Design a protein around this ligand. Structure first.
Ligand SMILES: Cc1cc2nc3c(=O)[nH]c(=O)nc-3n(C[C@H](O)[C@H](O)[C@H](O)COP(=O)(O)O)c2cc1C
Length: 324
């Protein structure tokens, strides 16, 4: 329906991407999005070892014959992670596109480039997107304040961050954070982006491999039901508001709090159980304020189809109508 610099550059049907999703970004998710016409990604670090990732890629290929990418998130953790080996596994597997995120991606970007693997780098500021562009990425994903996950510390929403980035960048731009439907798509495109990336919206789909209680929580949640944890540590993350995030906020409020004082609460091992068991209070789980615009659970195929058709109608009916 839409042809943009994004669809042309990455060879996909729709200007819609399903970026990194720790714990959730497995074969079922990626295959559903790939089969739906969008740019899908398997979460590399969701797999416990480079070998596990190779196997997951194979499993995904059994569910879809269409190409998909892999997200490589650079954890600021101190516990050694065989990043180099994960990269090697991604390349050896024939992956043609990778979405990198985190600090100091340079080393990985260069390696991927040497092997003809395109790179999309998720950034939270214009200065970061520019540095990434100078490093040679194929596109930049501009994550705004609205996003689930790490929005950085500048607190600039997409309405301003996107045009600000479009004013300076040359490579294609992917808008990320706060998008869920055709209205968001058109807004993103008008602001200077060539596609939209979504996370929360994909949690609320039939194929997303998570407990039905989580999908129900997203539908029931309004736009004001998310918390920004670890702001006092300059490691801000937007998560679903629950007993855990609220407790983390209480701890930070007391002042003099360090990561060690919350490591047990924000634990990833604890958060992954939210998606598996469906207990939304077991731990911290990512969700964006965009949940307030979500109240259904379509199959990924119809979802993407409806988004582009809605966007098309907004242009040809609503907007052109105002001009007539
Ligand atoms: C459950 C969940 C897990 C996520 N995991 C990661 C991750 O491991 N790495 C990363 O760079 N972004 C991660 N994200 C962020 C998304 O890739 C995307 O940038 C964000 O969801 C966009 O905001 P939206 O939720 O409003 O669409 C995650 C988001 C969700 C909802």
């Amino acid at each position: 329906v839409f042809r943009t610099r994004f669809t042309e550059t990455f060879g996909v049907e729709h200007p819609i991407m399903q970026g990194g999703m720790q714990w959730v970004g497995r074969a079922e998710m990626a295959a559903a999005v790939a089969n739906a016409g969008g740019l899908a990604t398997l979460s590399a670090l969701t797999q416990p070892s480079p070998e596990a990732l190779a196997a997951e890629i194979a499993r995904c290929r059994e569910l879809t014959d269409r190409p998909f990418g892999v997200n490589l998130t650079l954890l600021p953790t101190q516990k050694p992670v065989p990043y180099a080996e994960y990269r090697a596994a991604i390349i050896e597997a024939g992956i043609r596109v990778v979405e990198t995120a985190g600090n100091d991606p340079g080393e990985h970007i260069a390696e991927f480039r040497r092997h003809g693997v395109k790179v999309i780098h998720k950034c939270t500021a214009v200065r970061h997107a520019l540095k990434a562009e100078r490093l040679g990425v194929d596109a930049v994903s501009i994550d705004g304040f609205e996003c689930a996950g790490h929005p950085g510390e500048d607190d600039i929403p997409g309405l301003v961050l996107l045009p600000a980035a479009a004013n300076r960048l040359r490579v294609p731009i992917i808008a990320s954070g706060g998008f869920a439907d055709g209205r968001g798509l058109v807004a993103a495109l008008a602001l200077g982006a060539d596609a939209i990336n979504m996370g929360t919206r994909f949690l609320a789909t039939r194929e997303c491999p998570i407990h039905p209680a989580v999908k129900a929580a997203i539908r029931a949640a309004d736009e004001r039901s998310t918390d920004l944890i670890m702001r006092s540590l300059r490691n801000t993350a937007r998560v679903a508001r629950n007993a855990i995030s609220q407790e983390v906020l209480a701890i930070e409020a007391r002042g003099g709090a360090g990561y060690a004082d919350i490591a047990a609460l924000v634990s990833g091992q604890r958060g992954r159980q939210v998606y598996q068991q469906g207990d939304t209070d077991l731990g911290i789980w990512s969700a964006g304020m965009v949940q307030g615009l979500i109240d259904d659970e379509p199959a990924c195929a119809e979802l993407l189809r409806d988004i582009v058709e809605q966007a098309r109608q907004l242009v040809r009916q609503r907007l052109e109508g105002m001009l007539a």
